[PDB]
Amino acid sequence: LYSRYKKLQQELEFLEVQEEYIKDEQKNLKK
Amino acid sequence: LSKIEELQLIVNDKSQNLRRLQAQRNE
C-alpha cells in the first residue's frame, strides 16, 4: 500500500501552521 | 511499504504536543 501516502501528508502540514501560532499567542497575552 | 507508516507516526506524535500547548493557552 502506497496510494495512501498523499492523504496523510495533508494532515501533517495543517498542524505545523496551527502549532506556531499558539506560541505567538502566549507572548501577546502576557503583555 | 514502510513510507505511509512512518508518515503516519509523526502526525500521531505532533498532535499530543499541540493538545498540551493549546491547553496552557486557554487557561
Partner: protein, 338 residues
Amino acid sequence: STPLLPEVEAYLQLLVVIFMMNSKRYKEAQKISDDLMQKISTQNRRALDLVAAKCYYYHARVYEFLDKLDVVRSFLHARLRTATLRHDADGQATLLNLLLRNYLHYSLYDQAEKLVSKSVFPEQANNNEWARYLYYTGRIKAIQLEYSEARRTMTNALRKAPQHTAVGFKQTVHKLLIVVELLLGEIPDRLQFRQPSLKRSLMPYFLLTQAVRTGNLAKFNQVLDQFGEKFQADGTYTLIIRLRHNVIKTGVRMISLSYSRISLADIAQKLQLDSPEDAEFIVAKAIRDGVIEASINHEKGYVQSKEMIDIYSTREPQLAFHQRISFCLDIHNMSVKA
C-alpha cells in the same frame, strides 16, 4: 486490543504454571517454552502492544550463573532487526537491556560500546524507565576507570525504584557503589553504610572499606584472602587487583602534616609499615603526579614542601558556586514544568 489481551495472558499464565509443576529442574520446562515462542514470531507489525521478553527471559537467566545456553544471543540479535528502530521502539529497548546483561557477565565489554551507540538512536522510549539499564552501563564505565560517571548513573538508578524488590536490586547496586568509592580513592563515612543492603551482607564490604581507610596493606591482604568468593560470585573479578594500588595511594595522602621541612626519615618510618623499603620511589611518583608536590633532598635527608593558608582566595570556590547553583536551578525550572 480487547480480544488480544486474553490470548496472550493465557500464554503468560501457561508459562508460570510449568515451573515446578511440569518441571523439577530449570531445563525441562524449556521444551514447552520453545514451541510457544512461535507465536511472537508470527505476528510482525500486527501488534506492538506486547511483552515477549518473558519466554526468552526464563531461558536466559540460567545462562548467567555459569551454564551453557549461549544460543540465546542469536535469538536476541534477530529481534533487534524485527523492530525497525522507527517501529516498535519501547519493546526493542527492553530487549537491548537483556542482551547487554548477557554480554556484561561474560567477556568483551567492547561490544557494549557499540550497544550504547545504538541506544542513543531515534526511539520512542527512554532508557531510564528501568534503572537496571544504568546498573549495567555503570560497570562498563567503571572498568574504563571513570569513577565519577559510574557514580552518577548508579545513584540515579537508586532513585525511583526501590521500595519493593529493594531486596535483591539494592544489594547488587550497593556492593558496586562501595567498590567505586574505593577505586576513586575518596571513601565516605561508616555511619551511612550500615542501613543500605541486608546487614549480614554489608559486613564483608565494611571490613574491606575500613582497611582501605586505615591505609595499611597487610590487613588488606588478610581480609581479601577470606573474600575470594564475592568477586567471583559477582562476575567482576578485576577489582581484586585494582584495589591493591589504591591503599598505597591513600597512605601517602593521609600523611600530610605542615611545616616547610618534614624530615625524609619521618615519612620513611610511617611508610615502613606500608612497604618494606620501596619508600622513596613511591613518594617520588606521588609528588610528580601533582596530587601533592614537594622537593626532596636525600642529600640533607629532608623533604621540603609548599605551605597553604590561601584556600578561599582563589578560584576553587568559584567552580564550587557555579556547580552548586546549577543543581538547584534545574529542579526550580522543573517544578514549574508540571
